[PDB]
Amino acid sequence: ELEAIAQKFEAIAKKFEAIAFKFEAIAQK
Amino acid sequence: ELEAIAQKFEAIAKKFEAIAFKFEAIAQK
Amino acid sequence: ELEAIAQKFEAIAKKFEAIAFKFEAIAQK
Amino acid sequence: ELKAIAQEFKAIAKEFKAIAFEFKAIAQK
Amino acid sequence: ELKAIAQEFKAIAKEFKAIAFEFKAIAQK
Amino acid sequence: ELKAIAQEFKAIAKEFKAIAFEFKAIAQK
């Protein structure tokens, strides 16, 4: 379960990075 | 503690869903 | 590891609060 | 971009629910 | 919507602090 | 503000990766 919890936290990390790039795109205009 | 940690992660999930719907509302305009 | 996990969750909490204040600034206009 | 950000937050919410599930399984030993 | 999104992130930050608290309690056995 | 929000989400993503790392270390006993 602990390894599955780590895997999903890394997937969550990737998604927040994806969100970041979206905000950069809006900031660009 | 583990059950309390799961409960709060589910509450966090609900809040991110609430945020999502807000962004959809801004996207609608 | 558990204390390090708590520390980082508190650091994450601070960052979401920082994000919040940024959205308030955009909302102000 | 805004709608895409909304979709990511929904997917983030789902990862946290799955995380909560794992912690529950750990609560059952 | 923007201010409401800010409020949710604040509430999210608080859930993570409470999560950190639980992990600390687990660190004390 | 938008770019700054993007930066915070990137830093948030990194905290979650470090959290995942800690859980992995707990998986090794």
CA angle D17, E11, C3 (to 5 degrees): 70
Contacts of F26 by beta carbon, 8 Å cutoff, 6+ apart: A2, C1, C2
Quickly list H helices, chain C: 2-28
- Determine which helix (DSSP H) or strand (DSSP E) holds D5, and give its type and residue range: helix D2-27
How far lies E9's CA from each of A3, C2, C11, E16, F14, in Å? 27, 24, 14, 11, 18
How far lies A4's CA from each of A7, D10, F27, in Å? 5, 20, 10
**Chains B, E: CB contacts under 8 A, how many?**
37
- Determine which helix (DSSP H) or strand (DSSP E) holds A14, and give its type and residue range: helix A2-28
CA distance, residue D11 to nearest chain B CA (Å): 9
- Sign of the four-CA dihedral B17, D7, E20, F24: positive
Contact D9, A19 (CB under 8 A): yes
Residue C24 tokens, joined: 């308030």
Residue of E nearest to C29 (CA): E2
d(CA C1, CA E27): 9
Contact C16, F6 (CB under 8 A): no
CB contact under 8 A, A16 and F12: yes
CB contact under 8 A, B3 and D24: yes
d(CA D26, CA C17): 30
Domain that holds residue A24: 1-29
CB contact under 8 A, B1 and E23: yes
Count structural domains, chain A: 1
CB contact under 8 A, D5 and A23: yes
Closest to F15 (Cα-Cα) out of A3, A1, C7: C7
